[PDB]
């Protein structure tokens, strides 16, 4: 029954998905005498928290009630009093919290704050789900780096194109539509300039109700990207580029005029660790990296990914010179190759989608 309410809490949180920007999804339910008197979710960025909505709806009923929150109630004093304080003042006598704040400086602070007012606090109810709920945000807050998903499509023998660079019909429309879901769950989409030169993709989210568009991140060492590429001309989504000092100043000017934001790194080669750090500083908590065997090569090599999703088509492309899924340096001994764990196997249309994660 404690789970029944916490589950309601989790379902409520889900209604805010993609309306909170970088803020976590949170659900709150106020139960008084066995009756649901208030429900809340965090629906808009920089706007009221779930507890604020749930408490207000509860009105006088908050007095003596219990409240279930999927994430520890904030405890810092900003423009308005913190939710833990809001709870204290409303008269709630018991609080059920799924999980603690991910920040080490904050964790337990709200909890203790409320206990210190008489309120009884039980923790852990449906933690796993509370976890999956804000998985990207959670990882971002705990490490300070965006959650990275690498994705690629290949033939059954591991090729992403023939020896002539032909990749027409390697993935079915069904697989492409299924992959399109990640363009909605990540804040940015990333590829190397090679993908732009070969495929000239828009890299946009074209799903049903596609409101916001993710930031398009291109890795372009020498700034050799075609000035007429969709990513530079369609204005559909923000476009950011990472180059080095070898980039041409006049070209940067022309592109900035197109609204492209350019980040010039101080190294001679682009370091994925550098770009991930700069994206986090910009508030990008997630990256859908979908292209360039070499780009995928660096992320793997550096160990900078949390999820790897490969789509395999029932086809065999020959190839000594056909390009494989992951290129670059790679690991030399089977003893140094990290072990992943298949997290999922799904058939989409005639293709098979395999998803795996580290450790």
Binding-site residue set for NADP(+):
153, 169, 195, 199, 221, 292-298
Question: What is the C-alpha to C-alpha distance for residues 163 and 143, in angstroms, rounded to an integer?
Answer: 40
From 76-84, 157-165, 173-181, 193-201, give the range in contact with its own copies by CB under 8 A.
157-165
Cβ distance to its own copies smaller for residue 56 or 176: 56
Among the listed residues 49, 159, 216, 230, the single contact to its own copies using CB under 8 A: 159
Long-range CB contacts for residues 261-269, cutoff 8 Å, separation at least 24: 262/223, 268/244, 269/221, 269/244
**Minimum gap (Å) between residue 41 Cβ and Zn ion:** 12
Which residues sit in the known binding site for Zn(2+)?
49, 74, 83
CA-closest candidate to residue 133, choices 69, 85, 190 = 69
Copy the structure tokens of residue 337. Answer: 């190759």
User: Helices (DSSP H) in 144-220: which residue ranges?
Assistant: 173-179, 182-185, 193-199
- The SS3 of residue 15 is helix
Which among its own copies, Zn ion, none contacts residue 173 (Cβ within 5 to 8 A by kind)?
A: none
Task: Tell the burial category of 284 from Cβ atoms under 10 Å away from its Cβ (0-12, 13-18, 19+).
Answer: buried
Q: Is 116 labeled as catalytic in the residue annotation? A: no
DSSP, residue by residue, 54-103: HHHHHGGGGTT-EEEESSPPP---SSS--HHHHHHHHT--EEEESS--S-
Of 49-78, binders to its own copies (CB under 8 A) are 53, 56-57, 61
**Minimum gap (Å) between residue 179 Cβ and its own copies:** 17
Distance from chain centroid for Cα 201: 21
Residue 294-333 contact track with its own copies, rule CB under 8 A, x = bound: --xx--xx------x-x-x-xxxxxxxxx-xxxxxxxxxx
Of 11-70, binders to Zn ion (CB under 5 A) are 49
157 sits near its own copies (criterion: CB under 8 A): yes
From 66-74, 163-171, 183-191, 261-269, give the range in contact with its own copies by CB under 8 A.
163-171
DSSP, residue by residue, 216-241: EEEE-TT----TT-HHHHS-SS-EEE
Cβ distance to its own copies smaller for residue 182 or 305: 305
Cβ distance to Zn ion smaller for residue 83 or 225: 83
Question: What is the C-alpha to C-alpha distance for residues 313 and 159, in angstroms, rounded to an integer?
Answer: 10
292 sits near its own copies (criterion: CB under 8 A): no
**Minimum gap (Å) between residue 16 Cβ and its own copies:** 7
Antiparallel, parallel or unpaired: β 36-41 and 27-31: antiparallel
2, 21, 51, 120: the active-site residue: 51
List the catalytic residues: 51
Footprint of Zn ion (CB under 5 A):
49, 74, 83
């Amino acid at each position: 029954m404690e789970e029944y309410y916490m589950k309601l809490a989790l379902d409520l949180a889900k209604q805010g998905e993609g309306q909170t920007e970088s803020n976590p999804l949170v659900g709150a339910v106020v139960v008084k005498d066995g009756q649901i008197v208030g429900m809340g979710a965090h629906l808009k960025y920089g706007e009221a928290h779930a507890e604020v909505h749930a408490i207000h709806m509860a009105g006088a009923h908050a007095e003596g009630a219990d409240i279930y929150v999927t994430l520890e109630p904030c405890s810092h004093y900003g423009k308005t009093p913190p939710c833990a304080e809001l709870i204290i003042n409303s008269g709630i006598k018991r609080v059920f919290v799924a999980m603690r704040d991910p920040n080490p400086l904050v964790a337990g602070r709200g909890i203790s704050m409320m206990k210190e007012a008489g309120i009884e606090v039980r923790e852990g109810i449906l933690a796993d789900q509370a976890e999956r709920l804000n998985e990207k945000f959670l990882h971002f807050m705990r490490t300070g780096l965006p959650y990275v998903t690498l994705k690629a499509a290949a033939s059954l023998d591991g090729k992403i194109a023939t020896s002539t660079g032909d990749s027409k019909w390697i993935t079915s429309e069904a697989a492409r539509q299924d992959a399109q879901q990640y363009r909605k769950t990540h804040q940015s989409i990333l590829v190397g300039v090679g993908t732009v030169k070969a495929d000239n993709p828009s890299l946009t989210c074209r799903l049903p109700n596609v409101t916001k568009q993710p930031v398009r991140v291109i890795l372009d060492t020498v700034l050799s990207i075609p000035e007429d590429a969709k990513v530079i001309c369609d204005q559909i989504a923000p476009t950011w580029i990472f180059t080095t000092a070898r980039a041409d100043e006049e070209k940067k000017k022309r592109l900035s005029a197109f609204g492209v934001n350019i980040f010039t790194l101080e190294t001679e080669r682009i370091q994925i660790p550098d770009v991930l750090k700069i994206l986090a500083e910009e508030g990008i908590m997630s990256v859908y990296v979908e292209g360039g065997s070499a780009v995928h090569g660096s992320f793997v090599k550096e160990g900078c990914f949390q999820e790897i999703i490969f789509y395999f088509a029932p086809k065999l492309i020959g190839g000594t010179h056909a390009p494989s899924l992951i290129s670059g340096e790679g690991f030399q001994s089977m003893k140094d190759v990290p072990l992943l764990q298949f997290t999922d196997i799904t058939q989409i249309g005639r293709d098979i989608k395999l998803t795996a994660k580290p450790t």
